[PDB]
Nucleic acid binder design. Structure first.
Ligand SMILES: [Mg+2]
Ligand SMILES: [Mg+2]
Ligand SMILES: [Mg+2]
Ligand SMILES: [Mg+2]
Ligand SMILES: [Mg+2]
Lengths: 207, 170, 201, 103, 125, 40
RNA sequence: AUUUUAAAAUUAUUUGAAUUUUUCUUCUUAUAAUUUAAGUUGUUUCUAUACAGUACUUUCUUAACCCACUCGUCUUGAAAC
RNA sequence: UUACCGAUACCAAGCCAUAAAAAGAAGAAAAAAUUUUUUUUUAGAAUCUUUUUAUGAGUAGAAAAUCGUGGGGU
RNA sequence: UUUUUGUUUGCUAAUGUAAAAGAGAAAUUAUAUAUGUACCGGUACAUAAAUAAUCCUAUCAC
């Protein structure tokens, strides 16, 4: 579904109407009369195999390769763990500076693209969002120090979705790693953290 | 008494009802005393009555002189208010007696609260000038003295953040 | 003005403009060490400048001159005064800014070895036409009873020799580095070398 | 290198101002190597964080931060106006601000 | 400043203090409007005390609502509680300052039965 | 002219290209350091 | 609790024309949905698996930026020497 | 010559009051639970309710609505 | 000087930063010219001339 008004062609995703609002003189009613929200539409830059910096998270400045545009809008990303240390991670387009560089423009790696695409497809949106039960379990540990952390980690590991994600990541690594390693400079780049320095002015940097 | 005490078993009180001494001088004396061991305070008072150590007049210091003794308290001005000291000495003695009556060793007693309030003034007349009567009031004071024997929330996200920070530091 | 401490070589600068430049920086929040303030310049003739300063001197407080306009007449102090003139120095912020400024005559114990910057917006070379009369601040100060001018000059001269010596060594080091680079461009890889060449190094 | 930059360094100057009227809803930020309107415009949407230290701990820490949006450039010389969630205090007026690369 | 909490907009958390109430004890802080030539507050010079005005008023819809979103109703007696059985979400009880401890307890009990909030349950607790 | 063109190149570089240059410099430094050591 | 309808617009169909021959060509015959109509909705975190904590709301207290002259009064005019 | 900064004026939107203007003596809406329960509302006070638009300086002065004190009847 | 843990009766355990995120950068000098180098201020030869539009220094973990 899409609407094409004044030449845009906007694309409509069906949304749910969660919030109830108090009606004027009798009882409650759902706020959103609207049923179909316009889709995010990512910028003409975010591709399927570009390296991108992750600006914001714990993995701050690590350059990771983009994996899947995730329907929801925010996209998946991997620093094929065993290369970089960034796992299969979901991230918004905004907390990424996608570079001009592309993995699938190197002559060696470009031929492994179909498999990568397939792997990406295998990933879903709901496989990231942690279920309530797990969260509850995690919380339950708060009634020593390092022990607690360990327990939390264990709990995280336990989740089936998480396990699946891990497996996927591993598969991706297997697919990708050796070629990347062989292109030594590129591998190094992937490993390294992007930093601003005096001289790197930022507004002039076409990266 | 104006203090907060908790255990009055370790305290020894003492008061003067309406002392016919100047509030200002006696206030100064009290200030000089306060937070002293009782015996030391007593000693000091005795010295001042025999004009050996001054009491430094820091607050009510209009016109008060410029003694050599005031150097001891990092100050220029001081006096040797005798009458005030005597009154104060009496009340210290009373306090000591009270302590004795209790089971408080007077060596370990600190003046925790030396309060001097001004009391209701006695009124007299002085005669001035072109047939004008003026007041010639005393400024008496109440003295209260108290000697006293002397010798969370974690959160999961927050925890995670902390751990991450620690890791980064490492 | 994002550095910790700018040293400003005040030689060849135009007093007022330089001061103005300093003041804004100070306000923003930036320690500034104005160094070599004997050589600041003023845009009038010398005599004119002297006259102005004489007039300034004349304005003391009639009643009791211990208070009232202090006629600080070391060139550094003059500079400082000028700077103050352009700050809201009767506030707290202004005061802080003022404090942040240090001024020196010649160059002493750290500021020999710090880099010395220059404000080209306030350079006499760029700001006065060469047929205009200017005046060295130090000379002016001397004329109005500073005295320690010759001494300062001597000190400067002494320092210059040291600087020259240091510079020779530096030059030698640079040359050595260059040589090493030349040697060790051949020993890297080819592609990397090519890349390096492409971007200047 | 322990810790990575990922922001442009900045100086929180005064508030938006007349000569003698205050307007504390906006602050003015100087961004390090940005000298013109045009260059300032690059940063216009970026998020700005004034992080600062305190003596007492708060959420178990001594550092807190107020966030802002960088609303608009501020006339010719690369200064930008930044609007913060809560107004920044004038205790801040010489201080460093971090202008993040997000968005 | 403006003090949003949710839909409650308060335009002015600061009280309007009487002009010069700060200077003389005899002048209490209770707002009094300065008459008098040359007042400066009356004349509204920059930097002086503000004058309360009808512009400051809260939106007709949220006006007497407390942070609770509930109109306060003061209650002296159980009988009075009854009007708010049919309004237990819109109104919240305050028990009158003069009500005795036993009576207060009783009132609190009644309120609990009604599901109606009591804003001063803790009095004499 | 040379310097201008170098500047232009620097301006127009990709992140990766910058990283490449950095890597190259590092390599050179290593080599350079070794040579210095040898000299000393 | 029927002007958050009607229509406009859009999408996918269906009948008939038009000269701007056009994957946005227009009108109109009918039908469904949609929002560009018909004033912000969603998603995910956090507060938080908390009963008050250092967070949150609030009072006071200090600073800081900017501003601010003693009110009353007679007076053309008062911060008034 | 541009660009900029710059008011309580201007503009857009919100909220208050005033003024005027429209206009007004019957009914299920939703969510959450698991087809039935629970959760809120289910309005109709004419000097009142809903909505609209404009406007808002002010001494002397005028008016209205409010607020409070001592006592009275209810 | 070094290490550890901390600063989450008036007191007797104890905290503050007008500014850390690479806060990097020592010729000198003239401005209708300078600077070196080598000889005797002079001569000859190099060198800079959008000079921080640069150079240095970062990531290669154990
Ligand atoms: Mg007047
Ligand atoms: Mg003023
Ligand atoms: Mg007259
Ligand atoms: Mg007056
Ligand atoms: Mg009016």
């Amino acid at each position: 579904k899409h609407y094409n008004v004044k030449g845009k062609k906007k694309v409509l995703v069906p949304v749910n109407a969660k919030k109830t609002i108090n009606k004027k003189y009798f009882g409650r009613k759902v706020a959103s009369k609207k049923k179909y929200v316009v889709q995010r539409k990512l910028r003409k830059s975010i591709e399927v195999g570009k390296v991108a910096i992750i600006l914001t998270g714990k993995h701050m400045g690590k350059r990771c390769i983009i994996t899947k545009i995730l329907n929801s809008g925010l996209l998946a990303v991997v620093g094929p763990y065993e290369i970089n240390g960034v796992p299969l991670k979901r991230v918004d387009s905004r907390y990424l500076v996608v570079t001009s560089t592309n993995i699938f423009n190197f002559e060696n790696i470009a031929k492994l693209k179909d498999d990568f695409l397939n792997y990406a497809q295998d990933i879903d949106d709901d496989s990231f969002i942690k279920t309530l039960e797990i969260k509850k379990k995690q919380k339950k540990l708060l009634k020593f120090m390092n022990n607690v952390i360990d327990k939390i980690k264990e709990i995280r590991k336990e989740d089936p979705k998480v396990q699946k994600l891990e497996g996927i990541q591993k598969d991706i690594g297997s697919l990708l790693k050796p070629e990347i390693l062989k292109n030594k400079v590129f591998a190094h780049y992937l490993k390294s953290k992007f930093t601003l320095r005096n001289d790197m002015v930022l507004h002039k940097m076409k990266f | 008494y104006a203090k907060k005490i908790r255990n009055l078993g370790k305290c020894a009180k003492g008061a003067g009802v309406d002392l016919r001494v100047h509030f200002k001088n006696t206030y100064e004396a009290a200030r000089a005393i306060r937070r002293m061991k009782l015996l030391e305070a007593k000693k000091y008072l005795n010295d001042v009555i025999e004009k050996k150590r001054c009491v430094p007049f820091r607050k009510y210091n209009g016109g008060v002189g410029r003694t050599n003794q005031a150097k001891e308290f990092n100050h220029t001005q001081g006096r040797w208010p005798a009458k005030s000291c005597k009154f104060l000495l009496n009340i210290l003695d009373n306090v000591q007696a009270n302590a004795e009556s209790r089971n408080l060793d007077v060596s370990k007693l600190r003046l925790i609260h030396v309060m001097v309030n001004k009391a209701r003034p006695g009124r007299r007349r002085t005669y001035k000038a072109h047939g004008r009567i003026n007041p010639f009031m005393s400024s008496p004071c109440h003295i209260q003295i108290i000697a006293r024997e002397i010798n969370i929330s974690n959160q999961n996200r927050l925890k995670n953040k902390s751990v991450k920070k620690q890791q980064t530091v490492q | 003005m994002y550095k910790k401490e700018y040293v400003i070589d005040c030689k060849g600068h135009l007093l007022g403009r330089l001061a103005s430049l300093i003041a804004k920086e100070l306000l923003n929040g930036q320690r500034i060490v104005a160094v070599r303030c004997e050589d600041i310049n003023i845009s009038g003739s010398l005599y004119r400048n002297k006259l102005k300063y004489q007039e300034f001197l004349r304005l003391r407080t009639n009643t009791n001159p211990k208070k009232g306009p202090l006629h600080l007449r070391e060139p550094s102090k003059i500079l400082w005064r000028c700077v103050r003139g352009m700050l809201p120095h009767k506030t707290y912020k202004g005061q802080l800014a003022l404090k942040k400024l240090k001024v020196c005559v010649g160059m002493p114990y750290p500021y020999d070895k710090k880099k010395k910057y220059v404000l080209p917006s306030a350079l006499r070379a760029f700001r006065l036409k060469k047929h205009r009369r200017y005046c060295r601040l130090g000379t002016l100060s001397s004329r109005v009873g500073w005295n320690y001018d010759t001494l300062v000059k001597k000190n400067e001269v002494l320092r210059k020799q040291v600087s020259k010596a240091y510079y020779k060594k530096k030059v030698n080091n640079l040359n050595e580095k260059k040589e090493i680079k030349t040697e060790a461009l051949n020993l890297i890889n080819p592609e990397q070398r090519q890349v390096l060449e492409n971007f200047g190094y | 290198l322990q810790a990575v930059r990922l922001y442009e360094k900045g100086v929180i100057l005064g508030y938006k101002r007349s000569q003698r009227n205050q307007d504390p809803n906006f602050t003015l930020i100087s961004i390090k190597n940005v000298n013109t309107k045009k260059h300032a415009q690059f940063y216009v949407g970026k998020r700005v964080a004034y992080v600062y230290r305190t003596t007492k701990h708060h959420d178990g820490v001594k550092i807190k931060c107020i966030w802002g949006k960088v609303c608009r450039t501020h006339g010719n010389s690369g200064v930008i106006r930044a609007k913060f969630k809560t107004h920044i205090p004038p205790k801040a007026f010489g201080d460093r601000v971090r202008i993040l690369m997000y968005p | 400043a403006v003090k949003k909490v949710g839909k409650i907009i308060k335009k002015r958390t600061k009280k309007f203090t009487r002009f010069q109430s700060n200077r003389f004890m005899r002048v209490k802080p209770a707002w009094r409007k300065p008459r008098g030539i040359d007042c400066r507050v009356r004349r509204r010079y920059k930097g002086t005390n503000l004058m309360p005005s009808i512009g400051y008023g809260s939106n007709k819809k949220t006006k007497f609502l407390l942070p609770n979103n509930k109109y306060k109703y003061v209650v002296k007696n159980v009988k009075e509680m009854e009007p708010l059985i049919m309004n237990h979400t819109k109104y919240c009880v305050q028990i009158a300052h003069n009500v005795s401890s036993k009576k207060r307890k009783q009132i609190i009990e009644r309120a609990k039965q009604m599901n109606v909030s009591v804003i001063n349950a803790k009095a004499r607790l | 002219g040379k310097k201008m063109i170098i500047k232009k190149k620097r301006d127009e570089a990709t992140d990766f290209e910058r990283f490449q240059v950095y890597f190259a410099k590092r390599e050179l430094k290593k080599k350079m350091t070794t040579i210095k050591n040898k000299k000393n």
